[PDB]
Structure 1
Amino acid sequence: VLYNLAPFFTFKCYGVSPTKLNDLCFTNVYADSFVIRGDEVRQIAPGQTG
């Protein structure tokens, strides 16, 4: 049900892959959310300063 919008322009993942997400078994999850400008989307990566 996540795949509903067409312009999901950032969905790449670091430790997992979108194909294997439905066959895994997570210990616990958290969902953090915020609203930023469009230029700062690439500023969220491990070690990516900005």
Structure 2
Amino acid sequence: NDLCFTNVYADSFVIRGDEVRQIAPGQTGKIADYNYKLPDDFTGCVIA
């Protein structure tokens, strides 16, 4: 609540509970590899 942001994106999708692990920087597995990749220097929040 103290900051300002240059631009903001909100990305949305559904996955299995045990795949939520893969939605983080530098992870791997079918989701991270073939569906949705975060950059290694990601700035942001993941919410599920």
For normalisation by structure 1, the TM-score amounts to 0.54
The answer to which structure, 1 or 2, has the higher relative contact order (CA under 8 A, 6+ apart) is: 2
| Count of paired positions | 29
Which residue, 31, 38, 45 being the options, matches 2:10?
Answer: 31
For normalisation by structure 2, the TM-score amounts to 0.56
> Where in structure 1 are there 5+ consecutive unaligned residues?
1-21
Partner Cα distance (1:44, 1:24) in 2: 24
Partner Cα distance (2:24, 2:8) in 1: 19
Structure with greater Cα Rg: 1
> Where in structure 2 are there 5+ consecutive unaligned residues?
30-48
- Following TM superposition, the consecutive aligned residue runs of length 4 or more in structure 1 with deviations greater than 3 angstroms are none
Partner Cα distance (1:47, 1:27) in 2: 24
Q: CA RMSD in A?
A: 0.7
